[PDB]
Amino acid sequence: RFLKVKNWETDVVLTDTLHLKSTLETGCTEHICMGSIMLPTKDQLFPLAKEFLDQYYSSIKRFGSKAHMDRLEEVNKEIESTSTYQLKDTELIYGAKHAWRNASRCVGRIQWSKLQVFDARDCTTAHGMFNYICNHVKYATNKGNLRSAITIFPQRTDGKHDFRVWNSQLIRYAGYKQPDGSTLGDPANVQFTEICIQQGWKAPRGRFDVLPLLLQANGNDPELFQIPPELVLEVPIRHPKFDWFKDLGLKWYGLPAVSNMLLEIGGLEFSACPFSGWYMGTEIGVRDYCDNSRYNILEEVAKKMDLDMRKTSSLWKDQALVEINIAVLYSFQSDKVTIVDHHSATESFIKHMENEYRCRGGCPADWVWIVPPMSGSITPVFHQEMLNYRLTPSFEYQPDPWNTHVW
Amino acid sequence: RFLKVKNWETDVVLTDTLHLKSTLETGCTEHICMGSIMLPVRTKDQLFPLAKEFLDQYYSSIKRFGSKAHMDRLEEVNKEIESTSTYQLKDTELIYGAKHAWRNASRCVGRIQWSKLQVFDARDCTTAHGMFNYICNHVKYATNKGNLRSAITIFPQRTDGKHDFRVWNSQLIRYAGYKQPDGSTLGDPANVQFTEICIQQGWKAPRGRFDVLPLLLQANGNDPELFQIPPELVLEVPIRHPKFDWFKDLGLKWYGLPAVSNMLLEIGGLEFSACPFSGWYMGTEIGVRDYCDNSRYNILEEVAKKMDLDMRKTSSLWKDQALVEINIAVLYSFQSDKVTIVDHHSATESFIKHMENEYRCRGGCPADWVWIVPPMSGSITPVFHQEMLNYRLTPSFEYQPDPWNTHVWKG
Ligand code: HEM
Ligand code: HEM
Ligand SMILES: CNCCN(C)c1cc(CCc2cc(C)cc(N)n2)cc(C(F)(F)F)c1
Ligand SMILES: CNCCN(C)c1cc(CCc2cc(C)cc(N)n2)cc(C(F)(F)F)c1
Ligand SMILES: C[C@H](O)[C@H](O)[C@H]1CNc2nc(N)[nH]c(=O)c2N1
Ligand SMILES: C[C@H](O)[C@H](O)[C@H]1CNc2nc(N)[nH]c(=O)c2N1
Ligand SMILES: [Zn+2]
């Protein structure tokens, strides 16, 4: 019940004691591993609050203090009376940083303690939400010197007054279905893009149109807003060798900002909690650009390189894949926008893992997600055994709002 | 209970019922996933149900379930167990068993070929010399002058655990590794420990970068003995690159026949501790792992220099760039010499089809994503996008500890 993890490249062995604090379930059993599956009350509430306050008060070296006991007491009385409770600013911030710290699929967690937390719990309207989000975007972007941030909207009450950001990311490109039968723009956002139009957006039907925000406040119907274009930092994609690369017409945005997840702290649920950091190059160049059900540009790039696309064994796809990822990195660096390559990032994560094992007794990690989608085994994380388990506070997936929303 | 897997590229959803027949444990719990962990004397008591399950499967496959032939076989095995404490498999059961272990191997991307396996019954073997002869024949047969054929050779099953047949090599053909006094390694760093044993056992090492290791063979629980595979039986491929003429000058070659020889084959509760098996390589095994792992030949740097890449910042992706050209070279060299090999695109695409077919005809296909996804270019292969379910079925191939750690030396 004390578990070891081995790195098969360095022979370093770490002992995991942290998993014994695990609460939630994995989806795996003694008889079946689901490691590759993408998505596997006042009475309920109090022990959750308690579990959280215990780790909060432990973290500040005041476990079993009067102040600790006083807070447990106060929170308990508030639950019994109000059916919920409110987090102190200090607890809110601790919770957000620790939700990030606990995200087993995140390779960038060495940065976890340096998260700018924006308390947006006083927000009451979609306009308010828009304002808070423009401020987030501007702060995180910081003229290209990106800073990690989260903005936290009011917590769920009865599930009928939910705050939700309908976009999956604050900043994404639209996708439309052409009469051609093909797809224009980002195919992953076809359904969302339609909903924008079904709600009144006038799409300029381009290939790289920054989607508008669809914001839902206090359970009400969601509203449309356009992010000030001057706040959306974008990078034209060129190659340091291939002069022709720029004619491909590619560009991407600098700010990865996940906005559809659910933040859980002390049993309290934050359904609207957009957060952002900075890209690892492969996210854009391997997944966004080369995935078959995304921008899927491998073939066109291959042709421009005049590769032998006759047989798979010429590895023409692999060759182009590398150059495309060279270009992304080169373009962001040239425009001074923060980005990290997959080698630096995974090397960072190995140190973080080391630090966590040493200072916390473990680091929950999902190998399937941590190993980059290119060049896997030449990155050190590939040779690193990882233990995956669920800790709270946490970021959780939640259903898309349209399949839920009672208009 | 039914289970759903989704391919996130095609939205093809499949339904697993086969996991219901799963016996062994995974290492995972409701509270922990051990999916990325590499590695997470039987009595009559446990033996007959295992025998019975196997014979029930076999007779179902041949459409003779509940036949007099089926029932008589069960009773025969029952008697043989309770009288002799074990039992012998018919030739037909051994063949079926071996094919199904391969079929059940959740880490093997090459399973589309599982029904075409040449099974060599070496259960009449008694000595290490006999083992060598069988293994020579396996190599000659499987190699087939470059037109590779899958094969497995099966030596006598375990009895009391004190008379085990074992092949001490991890693979039948592998290069020596020698640790030097300065700390550097000559040849394959993965094989240093085994090379040392061989040398200690009396092997005269040539001490080059690509020395084929001798076989170290243990029969009937006796001390192991050394044998040199006839070099004419060892097919090798000099590695060159289709565009880079300096590549040949790196001095690289590799052997054509991948033959795992340290695993344990379990069939109907019987344990076959010596069961070398062989197929043909997927290109990345050599070009990505064998050549480019930091803990193996580790040639990325030398290749990158000769290519004149910007090696100062990793963000030049010089490592990535060199890796591709190396893997291009391996594929080119093998094809040019007409030695069977498959690229990772071709292999993973075939596996997806195999998998889908397995869900339809069998109710599932246990698969270890972590191992199935190739070590370069992950998401441009279709397996990356495929949800998989991992579970353990018998017959199976199992890990066993290295013999030198358990062997009782006779002297
Ligand atoms: C600052 C630099 C950061 C880097 C380099 C980074 C990198 C990554 C990458 C590559 C993934 C895999 C996601 C995918 O492939 O779609 C991921 C997942 C994730 N990250 Fe991070 N991230 C960063 C910041 C953050 C921050 C600031 C938070 C929260 C405050 C966060 C929380 C998460 C969560 C919850 C996931 C899982 C998302 C999912 O399951 O879809 N990350 N990260
Ligand atoms: C015919 C072409 C074949 C191909 C292309 C192939 C491919 C592979 C690859 C790439 C691996 C991962 C190896 C590694 O990364 O260390 C693997 C694993 C495995 N294969 Fe196959 N294989 C083939 C044939 C076979 C045969 C004939 C058998 C048995 C009869 C077999 C049984 C297994 C087993 C048990 C593993 C797991 C090994 C381990 O866990 O270390 N394969 N296969
Ligand atoms: C269910 N929400 C997650 C799914 N989404 C919308 C998502 C999200 C990302 C970004 C993940 C991420 C998040 C952050 C904060 C930083 C960073 N570098 N990367 C990339 C991508 C992808 F794969 F690049 F397309 C998709
Ligand atoms: C502990 N079990 C054996 C581990 N060994 C010695 C082994 C073996 C292989 C060969 C795997 C394989 C086996 C077969 C039958 C076909 C094929 N294409 N590849 C590759 C590799 C590796 F890792 F790719 F180099 C290692
Ligand atoms: C089916 C499989 O789980 C799916 O393709 C996963 C694999 N690993 C991943 N890893 C990351 N970082 N991001 C992803 O979207 C995925 N997708
Ligand atoms: C720790 C991790 O499980 C280990 O590096 C695994 C990853 N996946 C693999 N996949 C294959 N095919 N072969 C391997 O040796 C490994 N090694
Ligand atoms: Zn698992």
From Swiss-Prot, chain A:
Heme b binds at C106, Y397. The lineage of its organism: Eukaryota, Metazoa, Chordata, Craniata, Vertebrata. Isoform N-NOS-1 is expressed in brain and colorectum. Found in the Auerbach's plexus of the enteric nervous system. Isoform PNNOS is expressed in the penis, urethra, prostate, and skeletal muscle, and coexists with the cerebellar nnos in the pelvic plexus, bladder and liver, and is detectable in the cerebellum. The gene is Nos1. The PDZ domain participates in protein-protein interaction, and is responsible for targeting nNos to synaptic membranes. Mediates interaction with VAC14. L-arginine binds at Q169, W278, Y279, E283. It is found in: Cell membrane, Sarcolemma; Cell projection, Dendritic spine. (6R)-L-erythro-5,6,7,8-tetrahydrobiopterin binds at S36, V368, W369, F382. Ubiquitinated; mediated by STUB1/CHIP in the presence of Hsp70 and Hsp40 (in vitro). This is Nitric oxide synthase 1. Produces nitric oxide (NO) which is a messenger molecule with diverse functions throughout the body. In the brain and peripheral nervous system, NO displays many properties of a neurotransmitter. Inhibitory transmitter for non-adrenergic and non-cholinergic nerves in the colorectum. Probably has nitrosylase activity and mediates cysteine S-nitrosylation of cytoplasmic target proteins such SRR. Inhibitory transmitter for non-adrenergic and non-cholinergic nerves in the colorectum. Belongs to the NOS family. Homodimer. Interacts with DLG4 (via N-terminal tandem pair of PDZ domains); the interaction possibly being prevented by the association between NOS1 and CAPON. Forms a ternary complex with CAPON and RASD1. Forms a ternary complex with CAPON and SYN1. Interacts with ZDHHC23. Interacts with NOSIP; which may impair its synaptic location. Interacts with HTR4. Interacts with SLC6A4. Interacts with VAC14.
